[PDB]
């Protein structure tokens, strides 16, 4: 769909069971979801933006379904205030930013 | 322009007679700078991240040149890895995100 940002642009996640609510963000290379249950396997992992860094645990190959697309991908989780789709992601539903 | 994500999306801005990139940001409220020259008053103000918290200056009424769009806006000025262009600037430049 197209989506303007005079609002947050919000969409409908539905990862591990969980329905959750994220963030389309084209400044973060990363997707980053707040501490959640997810099976399996994770190594540690730190990574940075305003303010500094966070340590987060790495998921790879998890399944996501933003807003009724399908996509498999690296998926960190610890402790961001907002749930986070970033660019690893975002390519996968095929988003484009327009101006 | 139409920008894919599978790189960075960073633009050329033209601010306070300097040139700088930014990165388009979606999921920042905020445009923050890092530290450059800019004339005039400016108010104090904490804003938050992944990692914590910062302090930056703003600035309001600035003109902003970004990718040959001019816009006017509250551009916040502080310790920031990277030029980032929030959406109070994205909406001005008509910058919708697609899938
Ligand atoms: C998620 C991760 C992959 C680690 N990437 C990043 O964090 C990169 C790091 C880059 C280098 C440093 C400078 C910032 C850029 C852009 N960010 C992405 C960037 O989109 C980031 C994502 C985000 C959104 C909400 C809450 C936290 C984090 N937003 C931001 O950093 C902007 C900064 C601002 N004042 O506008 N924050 C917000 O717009 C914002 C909104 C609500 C909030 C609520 C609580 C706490 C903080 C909140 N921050």
Sequence with gaps: ????????????????GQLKEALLDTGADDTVLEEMSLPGRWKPKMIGGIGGF??????????????????????????????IIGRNLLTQIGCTLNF
């Design 54 to 83: 966070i340590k987060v645990r790495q998921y790879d190959q998890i399944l996501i379904e933003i807003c009724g697309h399908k996509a498999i991908g690296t998926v960190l989780v610890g402790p961001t205030p907002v749930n």
């Design 1 to 16: 769909p197209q989506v303007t940002l005079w609002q947050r642009p919000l969409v409908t996640i539905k990862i591990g």
